[PDB]
Design a protein around this ligand. Structure first.
Ligand SMILES: Cc1cc2nc3c(=O)[nH]c(=O)nc-3n(C[C@H](O)[C@H](O)[C@H](O)COP(=O)(O)OP(=O)(O)OC[C@H]3O[C@@H](n4cnc5c(N)ncnc54)[C@H](O)[C@@H]3O)c2cc1C
Length: 474
């Protein structure tokens, strides 16, 4: 008959899904689909933790479609070839999907749409992962924002969209239709091992739409009230842990905003009100970087600002390796890198500390770090990750005066009792918090823990010297 295909990519859920809801209003014969794209899966920048989470979200999505009335088709190969072929073999009335903000996804999408148009099949691309699309937030001159302040002021004033309906009572494909597409389908969802990956480090929130919705609700029911200032301490479990759920769409952005907004209205405490407004602004910050990547795709290439594209990075491989292996000798840094490689997630305050360290202290092209994070983060996200690293050098959007973190100051300020440090560096649980914070540990009391790979003071003078020299040379 006239079935509609909904192509899932980073919206692995059936609830509050813009493109999916629009598709259901056009037809009950709604068949979901996911394509295992080799250019994504085989990339050297793919994190095992991310594939594990992804695979887990898909397992649940297969069930949701089954329960809804149809199914989730699985494909493996090139999208602009396989999607059009599948839609054609199925004489699809249309193929729906939610828009991407990333260069690769957008280029791929334009190609799939063109292939569909050629085949005479409708392609509908709608915005779903953002409360406000990049085209809705523009300045008085109709231009994008590269400074957060003005962006937030506009974004905040825009009326917020509400969650859309979950599609129900779907019509499954028939045997004859299934025969027509048989050659293009995988018989079953490959396991993590079959795909060639292994992960046993756990997750910030268990995989799947259900677990994501439960976490959102548990967070907004309590912990969110203390977000500010509990968000600043790595030792405290004061954040939501929903990052991978938002990256893969296990949770809808409108459900998240609504749950927080409802918690704000329910709250009668001023401090709780503030804490919730602060969390909400985190979501605004997320959109700033996503819109930035959309408007200025070259950001993905590396240092944006002209001065930084010329910065003389030292790039001592040995220093980088030590960083990736948590053998820097700086407790607060090694504890964080251990949390990342071991659990696939890192507290935001720690991401800032280790990024600054790699760029300011080790003086390594931050792209090596951006890539290492992408190779390990369960929430590895180009817009946010690139935004985070451009930040470590003010080389991109919303630049700030040159500054260099002192691991010791940060450690003392956000892990004053060294609880987080001892937690991830148990072999140093005997050392005094004072020494773990300052980074000055006596050889005997240090055991196998390495000594500082660099002298902060000297590295700091070196970085500024290179900055001022290039600053003048221009
Ligand atoms: C160097 C560096 C790299 C980063 N890499 C990523 C990454 O690859 N993927 C990722 O999603 N975030 C990244 N962040 C942002 C951030 O650290 C995380 O979103 C956070 O640790 C997620 O924990 P949470 O879900 O408990 O956050 P919460 O505090 O509960 O915040 C809620 C949501 O807001 C968003 N968010 C919060 N902080 C920011 C921010 N700084 N920029 C963009 N979005 C934000 C996330 O979607 C997050 O889940 C990076 C920041 C830095 C400094």
């Amino acid at each position: 008959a006239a079935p509609i295909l909904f192509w899932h990519r980073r919206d692995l859920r059936l609830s509050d899904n813009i493109g999916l809801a629009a598709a259901r209003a056009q037809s009950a014969q709604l068949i979901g689909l996911f394509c295992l794209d080799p250019q994504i899966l085989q990339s050297a920048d793919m994190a095992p933790a991310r594939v594990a989470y992804l695979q887990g979200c898909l397992q649940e999505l297969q069930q949701r479609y089954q329960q809804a009335g149809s199914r989730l088709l699985l494909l493996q190969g090139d999208p602009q070839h396989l999607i059009p072929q599948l839609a054609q073999q199925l004489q699809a009335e249309a193929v729906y999907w939610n828009q991407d903000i990333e260069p690769y996804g957008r280029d791929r999408d334009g190609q799939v749409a063109a292939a569909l148009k050629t085949a005479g099949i409708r392609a509908v691309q709608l915005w779903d992962q953002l409360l406000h699309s990049p085209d809705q937030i523009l300045s008085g001159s109709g231009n994008p924002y590269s400074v957060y302040g003005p962006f937030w002021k506009n974004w905040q004033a825009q009326p917020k969209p509400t969650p859309v309906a979950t599609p129900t009572e779907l019509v499954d494909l028939s045997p004859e239709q299934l025969t027509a597409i048989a050659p293009l389908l995988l018989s079953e969802l490959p396991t993590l091992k079959q795909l060639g990956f292994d992960w046993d480090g756990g997750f910030p929130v268990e995989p799947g739409e259900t677990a994501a919705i439960a976490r959102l609700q548990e967070f907004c029911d309590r912990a969110i009230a203390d977000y500010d200032p509990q968000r600043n301490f790595p030792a405290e479990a004061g954040t939501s842990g929903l990052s991978p759920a938002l990256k893969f769409g296990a949770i809808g952005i409108r459900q998240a905003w609504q749950a927080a907004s409802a918690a704000h209205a329910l709250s009668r405490s001023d401090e709780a009100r503030n804490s919730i407004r602060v969390w909400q602004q985190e979501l605004a910050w997320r959109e700033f970087y996503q819109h930035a990547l959309y408007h200025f795709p070259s950001l993905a290439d590396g240092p944006y600002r002209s001065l930084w594209q010329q910065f003389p990075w030292e790039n001592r491989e040995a220093l980088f390796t030590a960083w990736t292996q948590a053998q820097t000798g700086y407790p607060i840094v090694d504890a964080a890198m251990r949390q990342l490689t071991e659990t696939g997630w890192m507290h935001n305050r720690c991401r800032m500390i280790v990024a600054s360290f790699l760029t300011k202290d080790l003086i390594i092209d931050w792209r090596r770090g951006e890539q290492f994070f992408m190779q390990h983060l369960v929430d590895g996200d180009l817009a946010a990750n690139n935004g985070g690293w451009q930040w470590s050098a003010s080389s991109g959007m919303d630049p700030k005066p040159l500054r260099i973190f002192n691991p010791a100051s940060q450690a003392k300020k956000f892990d004053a009792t060294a609880t987080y440090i001892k937690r991830w560096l148990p072999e140093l649980r005997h050392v005094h918090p004072k020494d773990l914070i300052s980074g000055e540990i006596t050889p005997i009391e240090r055991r196998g823990y390495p000594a500082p790979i660099v002298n902060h003071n000297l590295r700091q003078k070196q970085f500024k010297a290179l900055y001022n020299q290039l600053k003048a040379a221009i």
